[PDB]
């Protein structure tokens, strides 16, 4: 008897293209499929209707694509649902799916980070859908005073605007100082509010910049030299500062800031630079001489005030969050699946960082004990470690340590995680393991995805293909078939990586077989794969001249803009003195991808406690005509 199945994201978004993957397993001939979407539970209105035919030519696998529109039934903050119902010939397969009201992204750029009373705020709102492509929709824009009360409201459509909405607001001369806010949201998605802040303050631009950096990104609690810091002072036009610096340190304990008055030093700034040390004794004396170990996990901060020898200008800068550590590194398992397949390799994706959170390059890591597998971190701080697992339900405890040649054992980082065994259907011992090389992956490259099969050999030969699905930006980007021929425990899919895969993707794969008496068994796995962040296209601004010298005031100059054909480019020029006073809330591509990554509907690095958990944790529903399906997803946000 044929088993029909449908796979959708387990959070559906309105006004955005969603793909439903349809398969007729062990069916013959052409299978017509009608897919409809109704509101739950009323099922009165038809929200979407699409049809297709599954043929032997396409191996009885296809899809429909459709777009649930913004309706009156949607938008007291209760979760909304739709009923997705696929009819294969006459057999109905139904799944109730959670709906997200949020319909895209808004990004807000202000011309500057800080403003005086009596000046104008220039700002733009970029209106994109979930694929980051420009859309024309209606947005509400608010400007909020520091008390959080909207002073100005606007309603604009970005139709025929290429997703760019230029706006402005005049700051009155009599105004409250502090953090102002621009808030924007799509008209159809009022729950999702996008924001940026700008400061309103009385200031003049400084003539130079002060940079305060410790010689290491941490303070090692047994370093008897104390914490050494370099003070750099340079005029905005690049020349070195001559002057005097006042440097004072403090220790941060949670939210408590404790100044160290005995650390205050006055030093000369000669040729733009100076050095100052917080001594270990002054640090420990300053917190009433506990043992030094009690400071581990706290952080240090440094304030530097630089005065020009003329005394005609002054600039203060602070560096905070310098961790007090016993180790230069820390190990994270956030990218490693928390489930393993007993009897199969278990792959660890170890993330090593410096104490500031930046990735650590060329750090040796190794699994404690067993086969002594040892790897080196890439430029993205990631290293892959593979261990064999025995066929037992015994939970897997794994400890990873750094093996940095230059460090003592006490200074090496360590971290332990636990992985639980994937639970099989009917204690069948049938599994699937996906594997990938974890080197840094670029668009245009090919990624070999390994499909590894664990199945007893009497049943083995029945598995002739795997279905795989690629999730990206919370949609189904791609779905296909990976063939298999009997006796092949390992087959390889050559996955060509394109800019469509930025910033990361999930590959979900499953096979299905028939136990005798008709019982259907579904076996699934999944992996998460990072793609190096870049723009989908590209954009560069550079000089269109030869840099024989720096320009003089009023000089004409040619700007060279290199980008995608037909792109709309919007510009701003800002005096870097502005950023000496405030450098927060600037738009960057790294921030855009971070927003995209927070919004992922997949929630784990891969695998799951069972086939249903594999699908759900990667952001997918699975529903079959013979009853195999994912559980309801409880919340719009990922568990914690």
């Amino acid at each position: 008897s044929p088993m029909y199945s449908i796979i959708t994201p387990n959070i559906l978004r309105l006004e955005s293209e969603e793909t439903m993957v349809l398969e007729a397993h062990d069916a013959q001939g052409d299978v017509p499929v009608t897919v409809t979407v109704h509101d739950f539970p009323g099922k009165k209105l038809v929200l979407s209707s699409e049809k297709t035919v599954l043929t032997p030519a396409t191996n009885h696998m296809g899809n429909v694509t459709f777009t649930i529109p913004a309706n009156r039934e949607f938008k007291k903050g209760r979760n909304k649902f739709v009923t997705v119902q696929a009819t294969f010939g006459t057999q109905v397969v139904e799944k109730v799916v959670l709906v997200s009201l949020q319909s895209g992204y808004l990004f807000i750029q202000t011309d500057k980070t800080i403003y005086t009373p009596g000046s104008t705020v220039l700002y733009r709102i970029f209106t994109v859908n979930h694929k980051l492509l420009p859309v024309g929709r209606t947005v509400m824009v608010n400007i909020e005073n520091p008390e959080g009360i909207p002073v100005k409201q606007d309603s604009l459509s970005s139709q025929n605007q290429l997703g760019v909405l230029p706006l402005s607001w005049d700051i009155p001369e009599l105004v409250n100082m502090g953090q102002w806010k621009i808030r924007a949201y799509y008209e159809n998605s009022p729950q999702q509010v996008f924001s940026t802040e700008f400061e309103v303050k009385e200031y003049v631009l400084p003539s130079f910049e002060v940079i305060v950096e410790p010689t290491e990104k941490f303070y090692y609690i047994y370093n008897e030299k104390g914490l050494e810091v370099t003070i750099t002072a340079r005029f905005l036009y690049g020349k070195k500062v001559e002057g005097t610096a006042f440097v004072i340190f403090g220790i941060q304990d949670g939210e408590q800031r404790i100044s160290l008055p005995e650390s205050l030093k006055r030093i000369p700034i000669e040729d733009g630079s100076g050095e100052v040390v917080l001594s270990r004794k002054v640090l420990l004396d300053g917190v009433q001489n506990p043992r030094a170990e009690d400071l581990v996990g706290k952080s240090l901060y440094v304030s530097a005030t630089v005065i020009l020898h003329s005394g005609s200008d002054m600039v203060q800068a602070e560096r905070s969050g310098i961790p007090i550590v016993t180790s230069p590194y820390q190990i994270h398992f956030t990218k490693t699946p928390k489930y393993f397949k007993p009897g199969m390799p278990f792959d660890l994706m170890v993330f090593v960082t410096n104490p500031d959170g930046s990735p650590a390059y060329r750090v040796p890591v190794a699994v404690q004990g067993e086969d002594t597998v040892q790897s080196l971190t890439q430029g993205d701080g990631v290293a892959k470690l593979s261990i064999n697992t025995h066929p037992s339900q015994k939970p897997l405890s794994i400890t990873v340590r750094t093996k940095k040649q230059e460090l003592s054992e006490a200074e090496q980082a360590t971290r332990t995680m636990q992985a639980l065994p994937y639970s099989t259907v009917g204690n069948s011992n049938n599994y699937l393991h996906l594997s990938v090389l974890r080197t840094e992956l670029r668009p245009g490259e090919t990624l070999n995805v390994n499909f590894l099969l664990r199945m007893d050999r009497a049943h083995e030969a029945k598995i002739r293909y795997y279905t795989y699905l690629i999730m990206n930006k919370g949609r189904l980007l791609k779905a296909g078939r990976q063939v298999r021929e009997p006796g092949q425990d390992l087959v390889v899919l050559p996955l060509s990586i394109t800019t469509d895969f930025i910033p990361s993707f999930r590959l979900v794969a499953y096979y299905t077989l028939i136990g005798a008496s008709g019982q259907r068994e579904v076996v699934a796995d999944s992996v998460w794969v990072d793609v190096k962040d870049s723009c989908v296209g590209s954009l560069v601004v550079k000089s269109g001249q030869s840099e024989d010298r720096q320009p003089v005031p009023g000089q004409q100059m040619t700007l060279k803009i290199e980008g995608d054909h037909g792109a709309r480019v919007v510009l701003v020029a800002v005096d870097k003195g502005v950023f000496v006073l405030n450098k927060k809330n600037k738009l960057t591509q790294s921030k855009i991808w971070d927003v995209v990554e927070k919004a992922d509907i997949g929630c784990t690095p891969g695998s799951g406690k069972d086939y249903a958990g594999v699908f759900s944790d990667a952001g997918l529903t699975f529903t079959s005509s013979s009853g195999q399906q994912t559980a309801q997803r409880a919340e719009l946000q990922c568990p914690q």
Partner: peptide, 14 residues
């Protein structure tokens, strides 16, 4: 090295 515990296949554990 890396292998799978089962009776069949090119990558089975020995």
């Amino acid at each position: 090295x890396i292998c799978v515990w089962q009776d069949w296949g090119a990558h089975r554990c020995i």
